[PDB]
Design a protein around this ligand. Structure first.
Ligand SMILES: Nc1ncnc2c1ncn2[C@@H]1O[C@H](COP(=O)(O)OP(=O)(O)O)[C@@H](O)[C@H]1O
Length: 279
């Protein structure tokens, strides 16, 4: 379930938190990769791990949130002032590092659909949990990928107008930005943006695009209902791998998730139901 580590154990796991194992500064603190051997913890198989240094009832609750499309929380360390979390390591890292490549040759249409479906299943599970788990803003980088490009959600369960909107890159739900109201439907909005990114291969907000195209959502929304002009939106790298019907339906799923009205947005289980026939 959840293992307890000491700092000394996590030093052995991470080579004393060597900068060679530094993975990046995350939303909640620095992240290091590590390796647990078969003998490190009884009942835990040898595997690569991510160790997060955070800059608890909640952590025990996070250890009960088990699902094939959530990153596994393996354990934790609370020692001195320090709070560390130990996660399964996602071999291919976050979706944003693959999706916005110029060519993204390892992400053909069916792999993108598989990623959209797994992310939707993870979010549906979180939304249907004993306590609703909702993100502050569901973004591309909350989707991590294993070696088979299986999607697993990360950082799950972990104001005034200016502070809500400052530094957002297009994933925060409209109603959260303007009123601060956060519900499961706010995640669905961000999921819809990521789905548009998967269909187009373009970042939600790109300042280097022409001003009419800088916001993916505003630019794409009028074409999502136009089946003959949907190819303006679709990733040119995907040409030939989808039918017009398949692209139109996935675009309609995205269209519904990015509705400005939260009441129009689907439940994530309905998104799963809509996308699986495409695969
Ligand atoms: N479980 C994990 N497996 C692999 N890489 C991870 C894991 N958790 C976080 N990372 C990576 O660590 C870095 C910072 O952590 P995170 O907060 O998830 O990313 P970001 O900085 O994009 O918000 C990112 O490169 C992210 O992909």
């Amino acid at each position: 379930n959840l293992h307890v580590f000491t700092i000394a154990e996590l030093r052995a796991v991470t080579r004393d938190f060597s900068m060679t194992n530094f993975i990046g500064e995350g939303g909640f603190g620095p992240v290091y990769k590590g390796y647990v051997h078969d003998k490190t913890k009884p009942g835990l198989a040898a595997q690569t791990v991510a160790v997060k240094l955070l800059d608890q009832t909640e952590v025990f609750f996070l250890g009960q949130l088990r699902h094939p499309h959530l990153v596994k929380l393996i354990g934790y360390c609370y020692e001195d002032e320090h709070r560390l979390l130990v996660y399964e390591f996602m071999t291919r890292g976050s979706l944003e590092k693959h999706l916005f490549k110029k060519y993204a040759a390892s992400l053909p249409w069916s792999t993108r659909l598989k990623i959209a479906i797994g992310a939707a299943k993870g979010l549906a599970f979180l939304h249907e949990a004993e306590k609703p788990v909702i993100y502050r803003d569901f973004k591309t980088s909350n989707i991590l990928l294993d070696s088979d490009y299986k999607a697993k959600l990360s950082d799950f369960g972990l104001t005034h107008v200016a502070a809500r909107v400052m530094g957002t890159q297009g994933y925060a739900a409209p109603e959260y930005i303007m009123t601060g109201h956060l519900t499961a439907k706010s995640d669905v909005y961000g999921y819809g943006v990521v789905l548009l990114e998967l269909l187009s291969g373009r970042k939600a907000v790109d300042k280097t695009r022409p001003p009419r195209e800088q916001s993916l959502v505003e630019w794409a929304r009028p074409y999502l209902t136009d089946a003959r002009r949907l190819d303006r939106v679709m990733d040119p790298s995907l040409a030939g791998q989808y039918s017009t019907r398949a692209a139109h339906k996935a675009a309609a799923v995205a269209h519904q998730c990015v509705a400005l009205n939260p009441k129009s947005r689907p439940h994530m289980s309905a998104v799963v139901d809509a996308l699986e026939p495409l695969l």
